[PDB]
């Protein structure tokens, strides 16, 4: 497998939703859009179960590719959720 591989998470609301902080992600940012992990908040699922870490990148929101979505669109679509979390991520840097 390549290091920066694309994977999907299937999770849901436990303590709360994610527990993660974001950096950049505006008009364009990473690639053809894209949002980037700043760091993990040690209060939620991302820490607890172990799914996302620093410098990981997001792609799709519940199947759908966010081609050219702004920071406001990315943030709004994160908070206007409810229970379930389906997303696709691209791995950032190498863990091991």
């Amino acid at each position: 497998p390549k290091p920066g591989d694309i994977f999907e998470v299937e999770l849901a609301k436990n303590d709360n939703s994610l527990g993660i902080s974001v950096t950049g992600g505006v008009n364009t940012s990473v690639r053809h859009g894209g949002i980037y992990v700043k760091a993990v908040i040690p209060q939620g699922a991302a820490e607890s179960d172990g799914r996302i870490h620093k410098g990981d990148r997001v792609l799709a929101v519940n199947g759908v590719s966010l081609e050219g979505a702004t920071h406001k669109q990315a943030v709004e679509t994160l908070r206007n959720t409810g229970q379930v979390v389906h997303l696709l991520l691209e791995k950032g840097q190498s863990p091991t």
Partner: peptide
């Protein structure tokens, strides 16, 4: 003034 062109919404988020 407002309701038109640009507001301030390009900083940092968490969820």
């Amino acid at each position: 003034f407002a309701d038109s062109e640009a507001d301030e919404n390009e900083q940092v988020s968490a969820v």
